[PDB]
Design a protein around this ligand. Sequence first.
Ligand SMILES: Nc1ncnc2c1ncn2[C@@H]1O[C@H](CSCC[C@H](N)C(=O)O)[C@@H](O)[C@H]1O
Lengths: 159, 159
Amino acid sequence: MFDIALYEPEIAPNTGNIIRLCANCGANLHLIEPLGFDLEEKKVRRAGLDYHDLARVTRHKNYQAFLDYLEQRGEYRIFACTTKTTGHHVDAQYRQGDVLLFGPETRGLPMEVIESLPMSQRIRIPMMPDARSLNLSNAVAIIAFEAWRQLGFQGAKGH
Amino acid sequence: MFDIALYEPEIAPNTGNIIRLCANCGANLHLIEPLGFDLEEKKVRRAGLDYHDLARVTRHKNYQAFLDYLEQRGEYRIFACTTKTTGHHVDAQYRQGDVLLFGPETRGLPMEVIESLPMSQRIRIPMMPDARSLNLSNAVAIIAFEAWRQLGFQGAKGH
Ligand SMILES: Nc1ncnc2c1ncn2[C@@H]1O[C@H](CSCC[C@H](N)C(=O)O)[C@@H](O)[C@H]1O
């Protein structure tokens, strides 16, 4: 129903956490190369997963490959998840086909990518005043579960 | 505000993640001993933390020490994150003074602790069927940011 996309993810445990999370809320996961890690079976199993958990995972050679993929697939909206905007994750009206795009742990999303999208499709999780940024998988968790809430948790156990 | 409490946390990176998270949303963090790890200065620095992040952290000898601390301080409600209930994190009405209680990664909260609280104060995060459990930090993030949302993000940058 909606997808999650990591731009050049750097830290493996984060991507592990985000794979569990996508299974939990039923999102597909997009990893835009280059990655700071391999999905080697031995590291994947050490973190309590296996090859079947990596079915929702699609790799792309670069950002433009990722855009070409979405166009040739169906209707979509990209949301740029960044500290560098004024609009909250709760003020966006989410819908089937949306893509939540997240920046790398260190540099964050490139200015060009964020600027390619209108204000309405840029979203910041509120933070205490003396705070620089959330851990990547925490940001994905928060924004993913706000989108899912707005979609009435379509497809959840007992719901 | 509201607080977060970890019952016998076992895995260090999770608790590191959760200390950053408490600073980011301005919650106090309660660690109920025994822990599965030491908080040695060299591991704390390796995980990108300092004195200021560790001021938010209060340790308790056991569950009852944690309860004694809370009643010596004012009104409070404990909310337990558990799979053993029907109520979603969204369906609870959170309020200033509430405490979000989380079980150890490898064990979950003791039956007795969950049973000590009424149905309304037991909460589960929605899950798609037959999905691996969330990383503990992500579960804390989801429930913490729902409580914060209901409190209109009191105290966030520019509020
Ligand atoms: N408050 C917030 N709102 C929205 N997304 C956030 C966020 N905090 C982190 N993220 C997401 O998590 C990614 C990794 S954090 C990167 C920021 C970097 N440490 C810096 O100095 O700026 C971000 O690019 C963004 O997509």
